Symmetry: D2
Amino acid sequence: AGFTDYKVADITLAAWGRRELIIAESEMPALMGLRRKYAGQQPLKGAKILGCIHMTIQTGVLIETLVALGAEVRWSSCNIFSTQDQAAAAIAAAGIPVFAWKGETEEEYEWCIEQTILKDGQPWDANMVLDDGGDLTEILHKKYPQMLERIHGITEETTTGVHRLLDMLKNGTLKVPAINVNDSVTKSKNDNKYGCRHSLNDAIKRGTDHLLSGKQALVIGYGDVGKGSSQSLRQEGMIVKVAEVDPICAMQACMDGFEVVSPYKNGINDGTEASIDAALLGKIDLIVTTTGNVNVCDANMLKALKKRAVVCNIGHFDNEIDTAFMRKNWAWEEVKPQVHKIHRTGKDGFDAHNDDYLILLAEGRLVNLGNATGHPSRIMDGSFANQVLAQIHLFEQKYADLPAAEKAKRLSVEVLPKKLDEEVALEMVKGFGGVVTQLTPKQAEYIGVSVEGPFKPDTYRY
Amino acid sequence: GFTDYKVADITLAAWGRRELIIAESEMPALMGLRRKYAGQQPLKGAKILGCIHMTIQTGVLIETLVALGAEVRWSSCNIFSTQDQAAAAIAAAGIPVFAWKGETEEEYEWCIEQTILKDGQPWDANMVLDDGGDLTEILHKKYPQMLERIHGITEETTTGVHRLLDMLKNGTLKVPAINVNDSVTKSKNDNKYGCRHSLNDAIKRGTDHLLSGKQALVIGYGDVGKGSSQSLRQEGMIVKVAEVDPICAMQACMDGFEVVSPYKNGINDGTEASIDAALLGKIDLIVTTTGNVNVCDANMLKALKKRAVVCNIGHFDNEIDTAFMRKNWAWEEVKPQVHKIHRTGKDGFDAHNDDYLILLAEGRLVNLGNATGHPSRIMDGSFANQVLAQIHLFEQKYADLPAAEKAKRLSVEVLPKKLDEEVALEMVKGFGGVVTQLTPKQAEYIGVSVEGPFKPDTYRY
Amino acid sequence: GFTDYKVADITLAAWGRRELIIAESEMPALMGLRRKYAGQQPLKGAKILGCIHMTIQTGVLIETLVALGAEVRWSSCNIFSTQDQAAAAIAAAGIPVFAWKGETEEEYEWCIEQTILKDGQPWDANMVLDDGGDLTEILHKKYPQMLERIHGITEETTTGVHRLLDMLKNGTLKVPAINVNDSVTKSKNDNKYGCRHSLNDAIKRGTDHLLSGKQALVIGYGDVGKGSSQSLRQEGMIVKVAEVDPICAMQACMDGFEVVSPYKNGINDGTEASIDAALLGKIDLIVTTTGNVNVCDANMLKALKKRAVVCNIGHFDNEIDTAFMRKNWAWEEVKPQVHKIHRTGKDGFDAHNDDYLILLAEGRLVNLGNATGHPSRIMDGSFANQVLAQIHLFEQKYADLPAAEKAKRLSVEVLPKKLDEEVALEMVKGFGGVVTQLTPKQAEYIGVSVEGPFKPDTYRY
Amino acid sequence: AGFTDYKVADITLAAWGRRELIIAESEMPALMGLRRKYAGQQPLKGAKILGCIHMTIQTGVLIETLVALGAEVRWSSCNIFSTQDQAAAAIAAAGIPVFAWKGETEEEYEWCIEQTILKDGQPWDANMVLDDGGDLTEILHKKYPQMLERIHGITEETTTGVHRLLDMLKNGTLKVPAINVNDSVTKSKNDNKYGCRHSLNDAIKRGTDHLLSGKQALVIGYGDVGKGSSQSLRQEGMIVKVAEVDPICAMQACMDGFEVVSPYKNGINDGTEASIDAALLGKIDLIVTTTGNVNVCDANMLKALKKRAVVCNIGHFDNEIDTAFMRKNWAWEEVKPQVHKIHRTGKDGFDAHNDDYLILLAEGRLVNLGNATGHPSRIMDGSFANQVLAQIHLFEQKYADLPAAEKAKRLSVEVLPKKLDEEVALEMVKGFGGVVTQLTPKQAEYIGVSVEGPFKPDTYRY
Ligand SMILES: NC(=O)c1ccc[n+]([C@@H]2O[C@H](COP(=O)([O-])OP(=O)(O)OC[C@H]3O[C@@H](n4cnc5c(N)ncnc54)[C@H](O)[C@@H]3O)[C@@H](O)[C@H]2O)c1
Ligand SMILES: NC(=O)c1ccc[n+]([C@@H]2O[C@H](COP(=O)([O-])OP(=O)(O)OC[C@H]3O[C@@H](n4cnc5c(N)ncnc54)[C@H](O)[C@@H]3O)[C@@H](O)[C@H]2O)c1
Ligand SMILES: NC(=O)c1ccc[n+]([C@@H]2O[C@H](COP(=O)([O-])OP(=O)(O)OC[C@H]3O[C@@H](n4cnc5c(N)ncnc54)[C@H](O)[C@@H]3O)[C@@H](O)[C@H]2O)c1
Ligand SMILES: NC(=O)c1ccc[n+]([C@@H]2O[C@H](COP(=O)([O-])OP(=O)(O)OC[C@H]3O[C@@H](n4cnc5c(N)ncnc54)[C@H](O)[C@@H]3O)[C@@H](O)[C@H]2O)c1
Ligand SMILES: Nc1ncnc2[nH]cnc12
Ligand SMILES: Nc1ncnc2[nH]cnc12
Ligand SMILES: [K+]
Ligand SMILES: [K+]
Ligand SMILES: [K+]
Ligand SMILES: [K+]
């Protein structure tokens, strides 16, 4: 009834959005179980959550779970290209403040985050933070420190965001306790790997409709994202090569059946054209960055690529690829939104029939969300169940109400306990129809565990 | 006139040496350590009791320890795992070894006894290398005095580590130990990729069965279960996975496996009634990978599809209720380590009976029992970790510390990540892989040294 | 001012031409044909009625036929397969095209008639390019006189080749045809690898469902069933395969699939009691690939697990008994070409009902309906064969022969192996593959020319 | 006892052989189905079959199906290394003439074939021939042409053997009709492909116990054996490159996710050291030949292979590899039977620790049979049910008794009808517990087939 506290691309997409949310709910049994077990207890009664994460249909089920458990929220997306407009619209239509649309400008992105922080032109009395990448965390610490005084914690979604949180902690600049949601196994070894397995080839097909089978790929990185990216491409029949700086991850790539190569002769990146292994890069049809590092597909690499190669990044930020070099030197031709040919013939214009171009997806931004719809609902079930648990926990601990001395002892970056990790997994497994075996008392004795778990020591790597 | 050994057949030594020479080219991390430290002789003074599968790969581990100055006395940690030509080759070089493929339990206990006793008295051992904890166990139970001279234990495998931790918890562990299993260049290399290579290998050698198109059930989805499922799936088996750990079960689903229990609703009540007879009646092959007890029990064995293959790839045979099969069913030996278990009864059997199971390696570790275990280039990582672990604890000299300092170091520890990385680098180079070096700006960006380590200790890979 | 066409949106031409220029770089066999033949204008005088999915790939084919001298009038062979930016680009180049995504059945037949009729009279067509046999059928039945001027038909797909042979068998085929489907660079490329690429693509775009860990049932294991099963298995689906052909079933077993039937003992007696309700109740996704009628029937649909996805990738939508569902169940459009079918009845539905199926593309070709069909680099094979077949038959001038000579020329044939190999060579070079040339001695050894053909006509690849 | 008409390695191996035959019977339901359906009618009564094919456990079941149908046989192996000594022994212990053992010499090999052809010094009154590779066919036509007057047919198992029959037919030198067993679908596209998938990596593991994952393989040829060989290595995690002279098979390898390469620069094999791709071959850890052609792993390739590469051939004849060159120039070190280190440092002796060697399996003979046991029972079931049906047909046609005018009409090389092919596959499928669906009349009518089949036109490629 006269709700206006939102900004989306097209409110008339709400019904489409509601139809997809009702479907996603059937794909997210851990989340919906959290709704059922906790709705009547309202464990988030009083929570006022600032949320900054891809405004997908999946995020929308996360949002309505938080709201169903009593929280108020104000929401923005953490990438300019990751929002699904029908999901944004549906969340707005439900009366939840949201500021998000696919294809924002950098200025619009920053404006959207401020709309969650500011209500009626002043700071919202927020007390919780949910983040994916650290951008909202950053603007709170740098621009609105007084707001953190009233905030109980941050539940942080992804690898890069966690890295920034730990840097602040080691520098004494983190102001509130955080939960590392990324490092739950039902997140990092679910979302980060299998999710990219599902969505990377999906995004490339939608952007280019390129045949992948029999073509040559180079994946930069073999962490969780690189593992699943490599799989996404190999299961399509690509000849996949992997680069790494970490010899352990490189060992895994070898054992998984990949050839480990470096873009630089002898792996030495001295900044010269001559250090590029030009013979290797001239063979590559597709390069994907997965590192969370800076400039791992650099300007010389881009100069050396096979004509018409595809270039994309599935790490969290776009600075994995020297796209700025490309804007400075090469003419860009939009094929369609989030697909650009970059003509290496020069800056001022281009020949429509030039064969010396590259195809860049989503302008170097996260490609699975930029050119497709990111991870599927049933994978995001695990990540977003971890989020809800982390919110309940930090909100219950009321860090913001401690004396300065208790705050000091209490400031930390923690992970969810294994028992909760295990319980999230059980619901995911049940979602597939899987049937977990129950230990007998003698067996639980024999391996020194409780029949209900945990089943592994905290040191276990899975 | 060297006689301080017992093997099946010394004339196999030349064959074993030829195979040892090949393995050294397949093991760059291990050989790199042999070359790096031979000059220092960092194990000079060490007297290592070793108990681990006497394979060609173990032979390269053994000669490395010796090249770094150690004395050793060796046995196998399993009655079926020895490669007789590896055993022979070692003995022929004057290294005390007591091992043959096909031992009895009584012979197995004697072989360990021979490493412990020298000329009828306890050898002045000061180090232990163990796979599974059997040698750790006999020392603590029958020769506790010897542990006063021992500086530590380097334990190879999951089951062994678990056993060390239980002693630690209970206050019964007498010397410190390194958990070699949990290096990433071991657990996520040996335990997974090793079983991927060697499980289907062993099934083919024992039965020469086609695997494609048939139904498998793998009990467990830890590192050995993940690897074992892949061994079968890549051959075209339709693989189902059983697990008690929901996180591991979640991985199995995501990896494209159906997760099932042998019991209805996953609840074992010890009766035939709780068996999923319909599930088990369709299973062509069952593989135990758990390190737990009785995970292929008697009722399961009664319900299995006629002519199913039964085997275990965890450390100990009690994963399968073979005792029950020995009590009630007649065993027909096909060839060594391959038995038909005729479910028609105890006294005798019909040569053409169709109601049998096939048991590989009488339920012992099947990859070692029916083939040669892991390939040299995988063991390379495990055994380089072992050497580094031996060098560490030998240099600590725990047995010479005063009590209060002993109390500080009485623990089960893992190798530092820097070392784990260094082993991995040598392995990657073995494949011709090329690792990229970080630039100074890039290393500053992700907060690591250009030289590593590259991940926090929490990282799971 | 060119007005002889009808498309969804002519202002999409520029986007279509960008995608056409990209797709030319993905189609070396086809663009090679422009180069070898555009100087000789072998299709000069050709007037081709073309009816095939109006995609970016069809656009490149279309423009290649024109570059070699042909006039064309074009429609699509499916109501949902058109890409509108392609139709727009072709229109804007001055080529008669009648096609948009989401036509009705009435509009579909209208669109075909606008190719046949020009200024309200029969076009003076002399060639046919068809995919599925719909254009062919309307000529023989409604405009038989136009065939007296037509030299031949080049038919794209398995279903249409079957219809042609039905006519050749009955003596009702009026002009000769090339069976383009049965080129190896077509059937074993397009039918198989095209569906591998494009089936999971279309399901992702339709539903965004995770496929890993879910249960699929693929009906059929011909070339489309092979590709589709791989499309799902490589995503981590647990795939079951149904077949009526024991040879194709044997391949599915050997490929690592469990072969099952929707019916007990495989006997479809038309009753609910014949349905394997346990199997169907576990299936998360069902895919029809047979080219047969009603292989996903009403009782299977009643028995499917709640929220199962239902789709067909065979040429014609009668593979699925959608008429049953239209008669008995309420349909909720999720978005275009995605429908929840609420099995609670016909009189409306509950928005939060859980007993529904999801139908893609209303049972029409799902890869073209919910994505974009095969990728350019695969269609390259198919469409090089099409172009070559057009030259073959046009240079043959069958319509100018006397009846007694027509009789001897009236057939359904495939391209000679040599052309098949030439297309394949160009496809291989597109990947950067390097074919090895035989030595004269080697060629003599195996009994072939150094230039090929390399296999006897009986060879199955 | 009393019966002495055989020569095997060790007769005491008979009991172990019998045990493996009994197992194999349960793995071969088509063969044992044939045995049950026809033992009563005795369709092979009076047949006298010269058999020449790898004396494995699988061949033993085949031999005993024929005997069970009324035939007498006299048997040798078609390869010097392929016999299973316990199978040979079990067969001779059953009272069946067999002349076969693992590790024959060339002189001994032809002696064994001769011992099947002669009984008591005079030619045996044979009247049927079962061959694998055409060697038996070749000795009969060259050296005992009179015996062919009494012989009703040849049933030929393999591609090389079929090629040789067609060339004799074209030349007018083939004296009796033949059935091409290789080209049943339940043979070619089962045995030739899936058989090698099972048995290639099997043989390499038994010979060397080498890790295959992460290493570089080069497969020469991508026919049925090539397709199966490549899959055998790739499923182990090898990085596999494929070479081919047929562009259609090369197109399949690309789409199958393989890089297609040639050992020669630009594919051009002109016999020069300069034509070799030294860079490529210096990266190859394993080369497998699958072609049925001659010298496809030649001297210069052997010179250029990466130190310690493994070299093996899975084609029928060992001349795919230039082993004669290696015998002439390099020193062979036997690791164990059928495993040789070939020291490229010279011919006269070697350094025991030389690093510059190749590993040659089975001395270049069929590696799956030389170093392991060839195909598994359940695959050979398809090949060998075809063989039995083929024998029944040609023995019943009584070609050798027909008038000359009818001989000329029936002198051909034929394949089995598709209906029998389908019936073989049905038994196979059933052996896996697969359930084949029955068409309804309406459906049968709609695709124009009978409900009983055949279900495909003869042009169908599967
Ligand atoms: N798009 C998505 O849906 C999604 C999902 C999860 C995470 N992510 C993001 O992806 C990135 C990687 O995440 P992760 O979980 O895989 O982290 P990770 O630490 O597990 O792996 C990144 C890897 O990159 C390697 N690397 C770093 N610099 C390199 C260089 N110069 N060359 C080659 N390799 C190099 C590191 O050794 C490391 O193994 C992060 O930005 C994370 O936030 C994206
Ligand atoms: N054969 C070999 O070469 C080899 C190599 C390494 C380790 N191992 C042995 O294999 C065993 C497993 O080792 P791991 O490293 O995989 O250990 P792990 O802890 O990683 O895996 C064991 C798994 O079994 C599961 N499990 C336990 N009881 C179960 C039950 N009743 N039903 C189903 N699943 C059950 C656990 O949840 C766990 O995931 C140990 O005995 C280990 O020492 C053998
Ligand atoms: N969508 C696409 O892009 C595309 C591409 C090529 C062909 N097609 C179409 O797909 C269909 C199949 O083509 P194909 O080349 O694979 O034909 P095919 O003859 O190779 O295979 C069809 C298979 O279905 C099996 N089958 C028939 N009735 C069955 C039943 N009731 N139950 C189970 N299995 C049954 C047959 O035994 C046969 O093996 C045809 O309509 C063809 O025109 C579609
Ligand atoms: N070891 C086994 O168990 C087994 C089983 C079946 C057949 N075979 C034998 O293996 C061989 C191959 O049989 P197949 O059925 O695959 O035959 P095939 O005709 O289908 O395949 C052989 C392939 O080799 C290719 N080729 C020829 N010369 C080449 C060259 N110089 N470089 C690269 N590729 C080249 C051909 O193009 C062809 O595709 C024959 O000798 C056959 O009898 C062995
Ligand atoms: N679909 C999705 N929704 C939210 N965050 C995501 N991160 C990756 N995929 C995502
Ligand atoms: N096991 C086997 N027996 C007979 N012939 C074969 N050809 C390939 N493998 C074989
Ligand atoms: K999604
Ligand atoms: K080994
Ligand atoms: K397309
Ligand atoms: K065999």
